[PDB]
Paper text:
Amide Bond Synthetases (ABSs) actively catalyze both the ATP-dependent adenylation of carboxylic acid substrates and their subsequent amidation using an amine nucleophile, both within the active site of the enzyme, enabling the use of only a small excess of the amine partner. In this report, we describe the activity and specificity of an ABS from Streptoalloteichus hindustanus (ShABS), with a broader, complementary substrate spectrum to that of McbA that includes enantioselective behavior toward an expanded range of acid and amine partners in amidation reactions. The requirement for large excesses of amine in these reactions has prompted investigations into the ATP-dependent amide bond synthetase (ABS) class of enzymes, also members of the larger ANL (acyl-CoA synthetase–non-ribosomal peptide synthase–luciferase) family of adenylase enzymes, as these catalyze both the formation of the adenylate and the amidation reaction within one active site of the enzyme and require only one or low equivalents of the amine as a coupling partner. In common with other adenylases, McbA features a larger N-terminal domain coupled to a C-terminal “cap” domain.
Numbering used by the authors: 1 to 163, 170 to 507
Amino acid sequence: MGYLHRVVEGLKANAGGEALVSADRRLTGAETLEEIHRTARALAAQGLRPGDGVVTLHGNGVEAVVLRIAVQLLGCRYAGLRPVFATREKANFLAEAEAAAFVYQPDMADEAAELLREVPTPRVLSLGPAPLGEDLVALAGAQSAEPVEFTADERAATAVGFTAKGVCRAPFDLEACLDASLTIFGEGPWRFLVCIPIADLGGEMAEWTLAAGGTVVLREDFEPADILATIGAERTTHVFCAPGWVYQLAEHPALADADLSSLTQIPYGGAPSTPARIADALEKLGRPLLVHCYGSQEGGWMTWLSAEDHVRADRYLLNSVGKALPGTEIAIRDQDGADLPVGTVGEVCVRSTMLMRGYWRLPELTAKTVRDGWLHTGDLGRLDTEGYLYLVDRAKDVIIVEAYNVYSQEVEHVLTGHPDVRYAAVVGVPDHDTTEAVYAAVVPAEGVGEIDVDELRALVRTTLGPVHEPKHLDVVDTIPTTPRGKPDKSALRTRWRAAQR
């Protein structure tokens, strides 16, 4: 058994039905498994052993999934360049990757040249006929479809996902991730719309979709009109979305008429969500679909918020990423690294069998990052007693000054406690080039004449420490608020930013 055992088992399970689907080609589990075996054989022929690095430059086609899996079957290291990266960044990735092969989609030959020019690589192959190297699809066609058993170290990296640096994953932790996927997404066959690069997260999600006996529906990227069409046309059960995408789906005029019956779930994540707009989306979908996932290449799946937990009447949880997965442990830690009680804000630190094997060729930063089995995620948040995780909103609630975290509520509370101040709003605003500064607006109390701004600066300095001191501090008659009754801190930020003459 193992990760690839699991993928193959799901394909065999699904041999009669659809496994890989795109606008251009359609394969069954039988037809998919054959190509994988053939491709693996062909790659083996070219001279590729376990541990040998295989860099790819492709899109989200069927042959790209076949290749990603095949490379991993041999126990080679698949290293997908996402096409969205700049050529400068790809050349770095390729240079550092110690590649033995380079595999590129035919219509990207322009870029393959730029790269192979700068980083000459052996065994160049093309997914179909193309100017450079040989044609891998042709090589595979001419080849035995006899099964290829997985026979490498289950704990040896077979995938690198790029981020300035590359995250190695081994089958051991990939299976751990697949297990969580069944927790979050449910079990059984999934018709899973993947429009994330197969070069990384999309690839993982395709591997998993297949392992569970499912069909992958591939699109090249997210566009709301496609997708709404694709969902109904392919009777998809799941589409994984960035939060941005969820909003675009919800705001789309085509949505009233689109057929979403097939959907059981719209898992989303990858970036901070906007509670207000998620709530809009809940109303328009008019059904419990949204499931918030919190994950990284480094940490695997860490938490998730069920669909029901988006709409319970007794709690509000749109500011939550939900609770730990089975086998996942979460501590919140001070800038030095001892635990904090529930309720307190710190760095979210995780330990599960889903952690990455490490950063590629960066063994020192790997140790700065995973410390004694515990991933230091660099994200800031708080747990609660019911077990829910809440990541601070970095725009409203933190300010980073000289590499120190300043919390806006802490500064507000201190200012407000001055008898001359009845209300404060504190926000970080862009300063010189790439720094942040603490700005503050305070509302005077009843009868207060003139406010001594310097006194309030001293108060913060000699309560919290020097860095928490507001650089700028305006006395205002009021703080604008949002329609949900929270202080409008982006209005304050925009206003202060624009006035920096």
